[PDB]
Design a protein around this ligand. Structure first.
Ligand SMILES: CCCCCCCCCCCCCC(=O)OC[C@H](COP(=O)(O)OCCN)OC(=O)CCCCCCCCCCCCC
Length: 259
């Protein structure tokens, strides 16, 4: 298959490692973590959560346009196609709001502590059920207000990781499009970041590693499709000859600099 999508596949693999591992190790979320880690995880999570998350995406978008400038037309198309998918994804989202029942990790601990049997809990109206989680939270004094709210906002229904799809996609677009452009500092950061985000989902008890693997995989799918359209529509995203001699120039300019 194509060279651009070989690299996205390697990314998809790399991002699968952490969550597949943790899945295999059979680790489950318990409460009472060191609260610096909860907060640091919260911020990492927050770098994608919609209040502050718009900054990240704009800066990346911008930066990506900057890096992809020799194919700037191709890039705008590509980002349009993803802006579309986001809005499709928001159409898709609304349909799921009543379908999901699988609980988030923190819900399990929460029903243990309130001595509600697994049996009764799931023999409830989906709505009455998810409300009782919402009401049970605001009576718990155990957890700090910033997490309680997030748990309330998230609702302890294991909706697919929006946080991971976004973060992972960015990092897949990096290895995908920028690897030949020597954007080694970029790529690296986004991989670390994406995984930090995945890991932060686990630390808050928002998701199970299956979810992150699905989320990662959706991204691999989506990115590979979006890039293909942009390729078929607007021609290659791979650097042209003008781009290479500029790159190959900067290599030899750095070695010859010492002289
Ligand atoms: C030609 C059209 C192709 C058709 C493809 C249709 C795409 C459908 C794939 C999504 C289906 C997954 C189900 C789902 O629940 O998605 C909704 C997801 C949830 O978002 P939450 O509000 O829960 O999360 C808040 C924190 N972001 O919110 C989402 O964001 C889902 C979409 C994720 C895509 C983003 C990846 C690209 C990001 C790169 C930056 C964008 C730059 C503008």
């Amino acid at each position: 298959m194509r060279s651009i999508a070989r690299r996205t596949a390697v990314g998809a693999a790399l991002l699968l490692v952490m969550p597949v591992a943790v899945w295999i190790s059979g680790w489950r979320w318990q409460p009472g973590e060191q609260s610096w880690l909860l907060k640091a995880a919260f911020w990492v999570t927050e770098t994608v959560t919609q209040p502050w998350g718009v900054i990240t995406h704009l800066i990346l978008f911008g930066w990506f346009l900057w890096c992809l400038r020799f194919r700037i037309k191709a890039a705008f198309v590509l980002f349009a196609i993803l802006a579309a998918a986001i809005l499709v994804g928001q159409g898709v989202k609304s349909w799921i709001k009543d379908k999901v029942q699988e609980p988030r990790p923190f819900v399990i601990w929460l029903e243990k502590t309130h001595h509600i049997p697994v049996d009764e809990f799931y023999t409830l109206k989906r709505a009455e059920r998810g409300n009782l989680v919402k009401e049970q939270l605001a009576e718990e004094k155990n957890i700090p207000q910033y997490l309680r709210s997030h748990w309330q906002k998230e609702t302890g229904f294991a909706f697919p990781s929006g946080h991971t799809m976004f973060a992972a996609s960015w990092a897949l677009l990096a290895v995908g499009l920028l690897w030949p452009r020597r954007r080694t500092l970029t790529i690296a950061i986004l991989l670390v970041w994406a995984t930090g985000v995945m890991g932060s989902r686990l630390l808050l008890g928002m998701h199970w590693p299956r979810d992150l693997v699905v989320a990662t995989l959706i991204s691999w799918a989506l990115v590979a499709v979006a890039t293909w359209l942009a390729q078929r529509i607007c021609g290659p995203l791979t650097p042209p000859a003008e781009e290479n001699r500029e790159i190959a120039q900067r290599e030899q300019e750095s070695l010859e600099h010492h002289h």
